């Protein structure tokens, strides 16, 4: 599998099972759903009839009066009563198998290649930590909505990309499928390709 | 989430209350009565699509029997004449001719009498 580079106009040999795999949509949808469920915080609760502030005394007697039977003012059919199935703080995280997560990444990186949404350069640096310099460089690259993966830790690049919402900058380890889909273009350092190929076999 | 269902239950009640226009009293004002009256109106409408086809055939037959007895033959003779003369005119058209064109009904009667004789 060969990836031509943008700036120096060279080639780069990669694995076809990694960057030319057929798109398994149901796998990718399963992984993207589990990622968005892992982001889910799940902090809520309501009060049951056990947890409503009140007293456990019958508001009226069982019979003799003309009214309907009632045992508690905390009843979930009363105003300001409990919730019938009041919620608890629950964890919405799903398990994703490791081979299914890597199958999804190899699927969507093959699709970004087939859709020309993947740009490969040797290096992508900004000299001083300025968003004006980064926006100038991305305008010269004709890029607006982009993910920038770098096989190193560039602090000036992190600072120059922190204020731009169209732009996100990741390490090659910290890549995720929903970002790789949510961004229009993805720029990879050739080192980041080598690291992604090592992680993804 | 707490889905608040006021909009849906309002439009669902107004769909029934619009169908219940013209009804007397709470049948046009009250959802519990109107919905109970719309279902019965659909039952009657399903029934009376069948009863329309009965009642018009009965009306047509009574008009043919009258015009045939004006020309001096009964209905059952006249239909047996038109069967033996093979005349396949349905009795909507026979009632229409029996009203507007009594001459053509007389010619049909004479064909039926000649088919019986």
């Amino acid at each position: 599998m060969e990836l031509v580079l943008k700036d120096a106009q060279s080639a780069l040999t990669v694995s076809e099972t990694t960057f030319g795999r057929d798109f398994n949509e149901a796998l990718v949808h399963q992984v993207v759903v589990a990622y968005a469920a892992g982001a889910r915080q799940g902090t809520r609760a309501q009060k049951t009839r056990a947890e409503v502030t009140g007293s456990g005394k019958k508001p009226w007697r069982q019979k003799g009066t003309g009214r309907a039977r009632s045992g508690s003012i905390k009843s979930p059919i009363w105003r300001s009563g409990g919730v019938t199935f009041a919620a608890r703080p629950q964890d919405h995280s799903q398990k994703v198998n490791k081979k299914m997560y890597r199958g999804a990444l190899k699927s969507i990186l093959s699709e970004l290649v087939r859709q020309d949404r993947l740009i490969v350069v040797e290096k992508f640096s900004v000299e001083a930590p300025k968003t004006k310099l980064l926006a100038q460089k991305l305008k010269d690259m004709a890029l607006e909505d982009v993910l920038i993966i770098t096989g190193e830790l560039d602090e000036n690049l992190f600072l120059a990309a922190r204020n731009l919402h169209k732009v996100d900058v990741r390490d090659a380890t910290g890549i995720d499928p929903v970002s790789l889909i949510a961004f229009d273009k993805v720029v990879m350092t050739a080192d980041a390709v080598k690291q992604v190929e090592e992680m993804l076999a | 989430a707490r889905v608040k269902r006021g909009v849906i239950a309002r439009a669902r009640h107004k769909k029934i209350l619009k169908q219940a226009k013209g009804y007397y009293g709470a049948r046009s004002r009250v959802y519990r009565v109107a919905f109970q009256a719309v279902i019965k109106a659909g039952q009657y409408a399903y029934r009376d699509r069948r009863q329309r086809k009965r009642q018009f055939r009965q009306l047509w037959i009574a008009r043919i029997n009258a015009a045939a007895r004006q020309n001096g033959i009964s209905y059952s003779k006249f239909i047996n004449g038109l069967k033996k003369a093979s005349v396949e005119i349905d009795r909507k058209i026979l009632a229409d001719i029996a009203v507007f064109d009594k001459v053509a009904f007389t010619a049909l009667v004479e064909k039926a009498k000649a088919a019986l004789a």
Partner: protein, 144 residues
């Protein structure tokens, strides 16, 4: 390929029953429960093996046997597991290092199941007759 073009596989997601939401849903007023039983009650139902008041099967029938503690520390070994060790020698400590039998195991037999294609010295373990023939045919040396 965007987030509004993904879709799951066919038959993967099924909707799920919602009891007590109208005639047309099928699961109407009763919700699959019938009328006026114990089963229709909230929390209702009988426990396992309850046959009415009839004497259940697990008490009509007698107890039998006992439990051998030595069977929990015995194990059986395929011939296909003999290649997964290193050194070409097979002991208990080698199989436990290969995570085959487990730590608390003190006895093991080798059984004719699978097949081996390499000479393996077996030491301190019982061997069946067919595994003895297959090991000795592949070049093995069963000893103690």
């Amino acid at each position: 390929m965007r987030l509004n073009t993904l879709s799951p596989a066919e038959g993967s997601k099924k909707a799920g029953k919602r009891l007590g939401r109208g005639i047309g849903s099928g699961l109407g007023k009763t919700g699959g429960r019938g009328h006026k039983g114990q089963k229709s009650r909230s929390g209702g139902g009988v426990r396992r093996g309850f046959e009415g008041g009839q004497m259940p099967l697990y008490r009509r029938l007698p107890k039998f046997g006992f439990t051998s503690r030595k069977a929990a520390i015995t194990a059986e070994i395929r011939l296909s597991d003999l290649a997964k060790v290193e050194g070409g020698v097979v002991d208990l400590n080698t199989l436990k290092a290969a995570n085959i039998i487990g730590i608390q195991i003190e006895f093991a037999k080798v059984i004719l199941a699978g097949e081996v294609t390499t000479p393996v010295t077996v030491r301190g373990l019982r061997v069946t007759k067919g595994a003895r023939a297959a090991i000795e045919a592949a070049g093995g040396k069963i000893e103690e």
